[PDB]
């Protein structure tokens, strides 16, 4: 099966936000609103903001999952390639097979779905730090889009879902991801192609 990617703000007015990091050749993570697409280097910090209109209940969680964007591939599980799944770069919590990690959150949980076999990482939904208006999760993507035997140049989407303590849907958002050597250059290129 294919998880839904339908944008759904739900009762709490849930949606994502991204920083404005620009497109300098040195940039390591940058988001394109025109493409709804995040461009990042391998295993680098990707700040993703969580915005809500009202506070969700205690026990609310935030799950991240990757799927292939193209329908002929949508049904295939997104996972790390045969090289990276064996390079012993574990953080002690993430299974070596998982493409998406949450950085610096000891309460992160990693799921191998016993039915779909799809991977996800989920964390408690926390309130913003005092003085802030949103909450930020830091993600890492642990393979290149180009990795052979893995994503193999196929575009993926990340689906972020807001869930209750049972795992029921409260909210959903999504964005395309390209993990590449030069995010700044590739964003500039793909935005120019769109134009
Ligand atoms: O922002 C989060 C996040 Br993200 C996660 C969690 Cl668990 C809790 C909060 C607390 N927020 C809730 C929404 C509050 N504003 C009410 C007025 C409206 O005009 C703007 C939104 C601000 C405080
Ligand atoms: Zn790889």
PDB file of C-alpha atoms and ligand atoms in Angstrom:
ATOM      1  CA  UNK A   1       0.000   0.000   0.000  1.00  0.00           C
ATOM      2  CA  UNK A   2       0.869   3.687  -0.292  1.00  0.00           C
ATOM      3  CA  UNK A   3       0.520   6.012   2.729  1.00  0.00           C
ATOM      4  CA  UNK A   4      -1.581   9.105   2.004  1.00  0.00           C
ATOM      5  CA  UNK A   5       0.255  12.315   1.165  1.00  0.00           C
ATOM      6  CA  UNK A   6      -2.841  14.529   1.348  1.00  0.00           C
ATOM      7  CA  UNK A   7      -2.217  17.868   3.077  1.00  0.00           C
ATOM      8  CA  UNK A   8      -4.480  18.012   6.145  1.00  0.00           C
ATOM      9  CA  UNK A   9      -4.253  20.767   8.762  1.00  0.00           C
ATOM     10  CA  UNK A  10      -6.831  19.128  11.028  1.00  0.00           C
ATOM     11  CA  UNK A  11      -8.256  20.541  14.251  1.00  0.00           C
ATOM     12  CA  UNK A  12      -4.982  22.012  15.445  1.00  0.00           C
ATOM     13  CA  UNK A  13      -4.094  23.800  12.209  1.00  0.00           C
ATOM     14  CA  UNK A  14      -0.929  21.754  11.692  1.00  0.00           C
ATOM     15  CA  UNK A  15       1.570  22.691   8.981  1.00  0.00           C
ATOM     16  CA  UNK A  16       5.328  22.727   8.380  1.00  0.00           C
ATOM     17  CA  UNK A  17       7.728  25.621   8.012  1.00  0.00           C
ATOM     18  CA  UNK A  18      11.216  25.959   6.590  1.00  0.00           C
ATOM     19  CA  UNK A  19      14.044  28.419   7.087  1.00  0.00           C
ATOM     20  CA  UNK A  20      15.306  30.706   4.347  1.00  0.00           C
ATOM     21  CA  UNK A  21      18.825  29.438   3.852  1.00  0.00           C
ATOM     22  CA  UNK A  22      19.521  30.727   0.328  1.00  0.00           C
ATOM     23  CA  UNK A  23      21.377  28.984  -2.497  1.00  0.00           C
ATOM     24  CA  UNK A  24      25.093  29.687  -1.977  1.00  0.00           C
ATOM     25  CA  UNK A  25      27.340  26.858  -3.135  1.00  0.00           C
ATOM     26  CA  UNK A  26      28.332  26.272   0.498  1.00  0.00           C
ATOM     27  CA  UNK A  27      24.784  25.819   1.851  1.00  0.00           C
ATOM     28  CA  UNK A  28      24.070  22.369   3.337  1.00  0.00           C
ATOM     29  CA  UNK A  29      20.275  22.456   3.509  1.00  0.00           C
ATOM     30  CA  UNK A  30      17.870  24.703   1.636  1.00  0.00           C
ATOM     31  CA  UNK A  31      14.156  24.616   0.907  1.00  0.00           C
ATOM     32  CA  UNK A  32      12.343  25.620  -2.288  1.00  0.00           C
ATOM     33  CA  UNK A  33       8.773  26.893  -1.741  1.00  0.00           C
ATOM     34  CA  UNK A  34       8.189  27.046  -5.504  1.00  0.00           C
ATOM     35  CA  UNK A  35       9.050  23.330  -5.802  1.00  0.00           C
ATOM     36  CA  UNK A  36       7.934  22.316  -2.282  1.00  0.00           C
ATOM     37  CA  UNK A  37      11.296  20.605  -2.181  1.00  0.00           C
ATOM     38  CA  UNK A  38      14.113  20.304   0.348  1.00  0.00           C
ATOM     39  CA  UNK A  39      17.681  19.964  -0.951  1.00  0.00           C
ATOM     40  CA  UNK A  40      20.285  18.712   1.537  1.00  0.00           C
ATOM     41  CA  UNK A  41      23.712  17.156   1.854  1.00  0.00           C
ATOM     42  CA  UNK A  42      24.175  13.634   3.146  1.00  0.00           C
ATOM     43  CA  UNK A  43      23.596  13.256   6.903  1.00  0.00           C
ATOM     44  CA  UNK A  44      23.490  17.022   7.497  1.00  0.00           C
ATOM     45  CA  UNK A  45      21.068  18.791   9.849  1.00  0.00           C
ATOM     46  CA  UNK A  46      17.701  19.635   8.260  1.00  0.00           C
ATOM     47  CA  UNK A  47      15.641  21.987  10.421  1.00  0.00           C
ATOM     48  CA  UNK A  48      11.931  21.471   9.922  1.00  0.00           C
ATOM     49  CA  UNK A  49       9.429  23.672  11.781  1.00  0.00           C
ATOM     50  CA  UNK A  50       6.112  22.551  13.236  1.00  0.00           C
ATOM     51  CA  UNK A  51       3.361  25.201  13.320  1.00  0.00           C
ATOM     52  CA  UNK A  52      -0.060  24.918  14.942  1.00  0.00           C
ATOM     53  CA  UNK A  53      -3.031  27.188  15.595  1.00  0.00           C
ATOM     54  CA  UNK A  54      -3.749  25.535  18.932  1.00  0.00           C
ATOM     55  CA  UNK A  55      -1.918  23.240  21.353  1.00  0.00           C
ATOM     56  CA  UNK A  56      -2.455  19.523  20.693  1.00  0.00           C
ATOM     57  CA  UNK A  57      -3.104  17.122  23.616  1.00  0.00           C
ATOM     58  CA  UNK A  58      -0.310  15.654  25.740  1.00  0.00           C
ATOM     59  CA  UNK A  59       0.826  12.449  24.055  1.00  0.00           C
ATOM     60  CA  UNK A  60       0.615  13.875  20.539  1.00  0.00           C
ATOM     61  CA  UNK A  61       3.488  12.693  18.336  1.00  0.00           C
ATOM     62  CA  UNK A  62       5.164  13.647  15.047  1.00  0.00           C
ATOM     63  CA  UNK A  63       6.094  10.921  12.543  1.00  0.00           C
ATOM     64  CA  UNK A  64       8.338  11.150   9.473  1.00  0.00           C
ATOM     65  CA  UNK A  65       8.233   8.637   6.608  1.00  0.00           C
ATOM     66  CA  UNK A  66       9.688   8.622   3.095  1.00  0.00           C
ATOM     67  CA  UNK A  67       7.913   7.339  -0.025  1.00  0.00           C
ATOM     68  CA  UNK A  68       8.852   7.417  -3.697  1.00  0.00           C
ATOM     69  CA  UNK A  69       7.188  10.281  -5.537  1.00  0.00           C
ATOM     70  CA  UNK A  70       6.661   8.494  -8.860  1.00  0.00           C
ATOM     71  CA  UNK A  71       3.608   6.210  -8.891  1.00  0.00           C
ATOM     72  CA  UNK A  72       5.397   3.283 -10.548  1.00  0.00           C
ATOM     73  CA  UNK A  73       7.762   3.328  -7.576  1.00  0.00           C
ATOM     74  CA  UNK A  74       5.344   4.562  -4.869  1.00  0.00           C
ATOM     75  CA  UNK A  75       4.794   0.984  -3.767  1.00  0.00           C
ATOM     76  CA  UNK A  76       8.481   0.247  -3.075  1.00  0.00           C
ATOM     77  CA  UNK A  77       9.818   0.778   0.472  1.00  0.00           C
ATOM     78  CA  UNK A  78      12.336   3.629   0.714  1.00  0.00           C
ATOM     79  CA  UNK A  79      15.466   2.397   2.489  1.00  0.00           C
ATOM     80  CA  UNK A  80      19.205   2.977   2.644  1.00  0.00           C
ATOM     81  CA  UNK A  81      21.346   1.450  -0.097  1.00  0.00           C
ATOM     82  CA  UNK A  82      23.440  -1.707   0.376  1.00  0.00           C
ATOM     83  CA  UNK A  83      26.543   0.373   1.092  1.00  0.00           C
ATOM     84  CA  UNK A  84      25.188   2.862   3.604  1.00  0.00           C
ATOM     85  CA  UNK A  85      23.122   0.332   5.557  1.00  0.00           C
ATOM     86  CA  UNK A  86      26.467  -1.339   6.397  1.00  0.00           C
ATOM     87  CA  UNK A  87      28.738   1.628   7.105  1.00  0.00           C
ATOM     88  CA  UNK A  88      28.296   1.491  10.909  1.00  0.00           C
ATOM     89  CA  UNK A  89      27.319   5.152  11.259  1.00  0.00           C
ATOM     90  CA  UNK A  90      24.650   4.299  13.817  1.00  0.00           C
ATOM     91  CA  UNK A  91      23.750   6.845  16.488  1.00  0.00           C
ATOM     92  CA  UNK A  92      22.789   4.077  18.889  1.00  0.00           C
ATOM     93  CA  UNK A  93      19.076   4.473  18.234  1.00  0.00           C
ATOM     94  CA  UNK A  94      18.345   4.484  14.499  1.00  0.00           C
ATOM     95  CA  UNK A  95      18.396   1.124  12.738  1.00  0.00           C
ATOM     96  CA  UNK A  96      21.158   1.218  10.084  1.00  0.00           C
ATOM     97  CA  UNK A  97      18.545   0.647   7.327  1.00  0.00           C
ATOM     98  CA  UNK A  98      16.480   3.779   7.995  1.00  0.00           C
ATOM     99  CA  UNK A  99      16.879   6.715   5.598  1.00  0.00           C
ATOM    100  CA  UNK A 100      15.415   9.314   7.958  1.00  0.00           C
ATOM    101  CA  UNK A 101      16.800  10.009  11.427  1.00  0.00           C
ATOM    102  CA  UNK A 102      15.845  12.542  14.054  1.00  0.00           C
ATOM    103  CA  UNK A 103      18.891  14.280  15.414  1.00  0.00           C
ATOM    104  CA  UNK A 104      19.423  14.966  19.119  1.00  0.00           C
ATOM    105  CA  UNK A 105      16.161  13.618  20.522  1.00  0.00           C
ATOM    106  CA  UNK A 106      16.540  10.781  23.007  1.00  0.00           C
ATOM    107  CA  UNK A 107      12.815  10.029  22.853  1.00  0.00           C
ATOM    108  CA  UNK A 108      12.889   9.314  19.123  1.00  0.00           C
ATOM    109  CA  UNK A 109      11.374   5.982  18.225  1.00  0.00           C
ATOM    110  CA  UNK A 110      12.049   4.048  15.035  1.00  0.00           C
ATOM    111  CA  UNK A 111       9.379   1.846  13.516  1.00  0.00           C
ATOM    112  CA  UNK A 112       9.661  -1.079  11.142  1.00  0.00           C
ATOM    113  CA  UNK A 113       5.997  -1.591  10.200  1.00  0.00           C
ATOM    114  CA  UNK A 114       5.112  -5.270  10.600  1.00  0.00           C
ATOM    115  CA  UNK A 115       2.678  -5.067   7.667  1.00  0.00           C
ATOM    116  CA  UNK A 116       3.964  -2.571   5.088  1.00  0.00           C
ATOM    117  CA  UNK A 117       7.622  -2.991   6.109  1.00  0.00           C
ATOM    118  CA  UNK A 118       7.975   0.788   5.741  1.00  0.00           C
ATOM    119  CA  UNK A 119      10.321   2.714   8.049  1.00  0.00           C
ATOM    120  CA  UNK A 120       9.419   5.750  10.124  1.00  0.00           C
ATOM    121  CA  UNK A 121      10.773   7.829  12.983  1.00  0.00           C
ATOM    122  CA  UNK A 122       8.444   9.386  15.531  1.00  0.00           C
ATOM    123  CA  UNK A 123       8.927  11.858  18.389  1.00  0.00           C
ATOM    124  CA  UNK A 124       6.706  13.491  20.997  1.00  0.00           C
ATOM    125  CA  UNK A 125       5.196  16.788  19.889  1.00  0.00           C
ATOM    126  CA  UNK A 126       6.786  19.339  22.225  1.00  0.00           C
ATOM    127  CA  UNK A 127       5.902  23.003  22.842  1.00  0.00           C
ATOM    128  CA  UNK A 128       8.266  25.709  21.526  1.00  0.00           C
ATOM    129  CA  UNK A 129      11.155  26.931  23.658  1.00  0.00           C
ATOM    130  CA  UNK A 130      10.231  30.020  25.655  1.00  0.00           C
ATOM    131  CA  UNK A 131      10.374  32.973  23.284  1.00  0.00           C
ATOM    132  CA  UNK A 132       9.711  30.933  20.137  1.00  0.00           C
ATOM    133  CA  UNK A 133       6.532  30.594  18.068  1.00  0.00           C
ATOM    134  CA  UNK A 134       7.108  27.129  16.616  1.00  0.00           C
ATOM    135  CA  UNK A 135       8.857  23.869  17.362  1.00  0.00           C
ATOM    136  CA  UNK A 136      11.808  22.612  15.325  1.00  0.00           C
ATOM    137  CA  UNK A 137      12.760  19.007  14.605  1.00  0.00           C
ATOM    138  CA  UNK A 138      16.184  18.281  13.155  1.00  0.00           C
ATOM    139  CA  UNK A 139      16.182  15.522  10.533  1.00  0.00           C
ATOM    140  CA  UNK A 140      19.033  13.729   8.767  1.00  0.00           C
ATOM    141  CA  UNK A 141      18.819  11.928   5.427  1.00  0.00           C
ATOM    142  CA  UNK A 142      21.332   9.092   5.403  1.00  0.00           C
ATOM    143  CA  UNK A 143      21.624   8.262   1.668  1.00  0.00           C
ATOM    144  CA  UNK A 144      22.107  10.295  -1.503  1.00  0.00           C
ATOM    145  CA  UNK A 145      19.178  10.402  -3.927  1.00  0.00           C
ATOM    146  CA  UNK A 146      21.667   8.871  -6.373  1.00  0.00           C
ATOM    147  CA  UNK A 147      22.734   5.865  -4.260  1.00  0.00           C
ATOM    148  CA  UNK A 148      22.806   2.689  -6.346  1.00  0.00           C
ATOM    149  CA  UNK A 149      20.632  -0.124  -5.032  1.00  0.00           C
ATOM    150  CA  UNK A 150      18.849   2.433  -2.882  1.00  0.00           C
ATOM    151  CA  UNK A 151      16.898   5.441  -4.100  1.00  0.00           C
ATOM    152  CA  UNK A 152      18.826   5.247  -7.407  1.00  0.00           C
ATOM    153  CA  UNK A 153      18.048   8.785  -8.623  1.00  0.00           C
ATOM    154  CA  UNK A 154      14.338   8.383  -7.852  1.00  0.00           C
ATOM    155  CA  UNK A 155      12.756  11.416  -6.139  1.00  0.00           C
ATOM    156  CA  UNK A 156      11.207  10.834  -2.719  1.00  0.00           C
ATOM    157  CA  UNK A 157       8.698  12.652  -0.571  1.00  0.00           C
ATOM    158  CA  UNK A 158       8.828  12.986   3.187  1.00  0.00           C
ATOM    159  CA  UNK A 159       5.419  12.715   4.816  1.00  0.00           C
ATOM    160  CA  UNK A 160       5.104  14.310   8.227  1.00  0.00           C
ATOM    161  CA  UNK A 161       2.082  13.308  10.271  1.00  0.00           C
ATOM    162  CA  UNK A 162       0.748  14.628  13.525  1.00  0.00           C
ATOM    163  CA  UNK A 163      -0.674  11.667  15.489  1.00  0.00           C
ATOM    164  CA  UNK A 164      -2.517  11.071  18.718  1.00  0.00           C
ATOM    165  CA  UNK A 165      -1.185   8.635  21.334  1.00  0.00           C
ATOM    166  CA  UNK A 166      -2.873   5.715  19.508  1.00  0.00           C
ATOM    167  CA  UNK A 167      -1.295   6.697  16.207  1.00  0.00           C
ATOM    168  CA  UNK A 168      -4.526   8.076  14.706  1.00  0.00           C
ATOM    169  CA  UNK A 169      -4.216  10.929  12.178  1.00  0.00           C
ATOM    170  CA  UNK A 170      -4.426  14.506  13.482  1.00  0.00           C
ATOM    171  CA  UNK A 171      -2.560  16.355  10.751  1.00  0.00           C
ATOM    172  CA  UNK A 172      -0.430  15.825   7.637  1.00  0.00           C
ATOM    173  CA  UNK A 173       2.050  17.736   5.489  1.00  0.00           C
ATOM    174  CA  UNK A 174       4.736  16.704   2.989  1.00  0.00           C
ATOM    175  CA  UNK A 175       7.673  17.876   0.867  1.00  0.00           C
ATOM    176  CA  UNK A 176       9.908  16.446  -1.837  1.00  0.00           C
ATOM    177  CA  UNK A 177      13.551  15.742  -0.892  1.00  0.00           C
ATOM    178  CA  UNK A 178      16.777  15.613  -2.874  1.00  0.00           C
ATOM    179  CA  UNK A 179      19.878  14.510  -1.010  1.00  0.00           C
ATOM    180  CA  UNK A 180      22.826  15.739  -3.026  1.00  0.00           C
ATOM    181  CA  UNK A 181      26.365  17.112  -2.947  1.00  0.00           C
ATOM    182  CA  UNK A 182      25.461  20.705  -3.843  1.00  0.00           C
ATOM    183  CA  UNK A 183      21.951  21.656  -2.635  1.00  0.00           C
ATOM    184  CA  UNK A 184      22.391  25.343  -3.447  1.00  0.00           C
ATOM    185  CA  UNK A 185      23.311  24.693  -7.062  1.00  0.00           C
ATOM    186  CA  UNK A 186      20.643  22.038  -7.545  1.00  0.00           C
ATOM    187  CA  UNK A 187      17.898  24.222  -6.070  1.00  0.00           C
ATOM    188  CA  UNK A 188      18.900  27.093  -8.372  1.00  0.00           C
ATOM    189  CA  UNK A 189      18.905  24.735 -11.351  1.00  0.00           C
ATOM    190  CA  UNK A 190      15.541  23.109 -10.651  1.00  0.00           C
ATOM    191  CA  UNK A 191      13.896  26.463  -9.917  1.00  0.00           C
ATOM    192  CA  UNK A 192      15.210  27.787 -13.225  1.00  0.00           C
ATOM    193  CA  UNK A 193      13.863  24.733 -15.062  1.00  0.00           C
ATOM    194  CA  UNK A 194      10.439  25.313 -13.492  1.00  0.00           C
ATOM    195  CA  UNK A 195      10.431  28.936 -14.635  1.00  0.00           C
TER     196      UNK A 195
HETATM  197  O1  LIG B   1       3.087  26.193  19.049  1.00  0.00           O
HETATM  198  C1  LIG B   1       3.050  24.949  19.638  1.00  0.00           C
HETATM  199  C2  LIG B   1       3.538  23.809  18.993  1.00  0.00           C
HETATM  200 BR1  LIG B   1       4.303  23.929  17.273  1.00  0.00          BR
HETATM  201  C3  LIG B   1       3.488  22.557  19.622  1.00  0.00           C
HETATM  202  C4  LIG B   1       2.934  22.433  20.905  1.00  0.00           C
HETATM  203 CL1  LIG B   1       2.845  20.924  21.720  1.00  0.00          CL
HETATM  204  C5  LIG B   1       2.440  23.574  21.551  1.00  0.00           C
HETATM  205  C6  LIG B   1       2.498  24.822  20.923  1.00  0.00           C
HETATM  206  C7  LIG B   1       1.965  26.020  21.652  1.00  0.00           C
HETATM  207  N1  LIG B   1       1.465  27.071  20.713  1.00  0.00           N
HETATM  208  C8  LIG B   1       0.076  26.696  20.291  1.00  0.00           C
HETATM  209  C9  LIG B   1      -0.493  27.749  19.356  1.00  0.00           C
HETATM  210  C10 LIG B   1      -0.390  29.119  20.038  1.00  0.00           C
HETATM  211  N2  LIG B   1      -0.988  30.242  19.203  1.00  0.00           N
HETATM  212  C11 LIG B   1      -2.400  30.594  19.638  1.00  0.00           C
HETATM  213  C12 LIG B   1      -2.827  31.878  18.940  1.00  0.00           C
HETATM  214  C13 LIG B   1      -2.637  31.829  17.428  1.00  0.00           C
HETATM  215  O2  LIG B   1      -2.896  33.116  16.896  1.00  0.00           O
HETATM  216  C14 LIG B   1      -1.218  31.424  17.063  1.00  0.00           C
HETATM  217  C15 LIG B   1      -0.895  30.077  17.701  1.00  0.00           C
HETATM  218  C16 LIG B   1       1.062  29.457  20.371  1.00  0.00           C
HETATM  219  C17 LIG B   1       1.585  28.433  21.353  1.00  0.00           C
HETATM  220 ZN1  LIG B   2      23.441   5.184   0.150  1.00  0.00          ZN
END
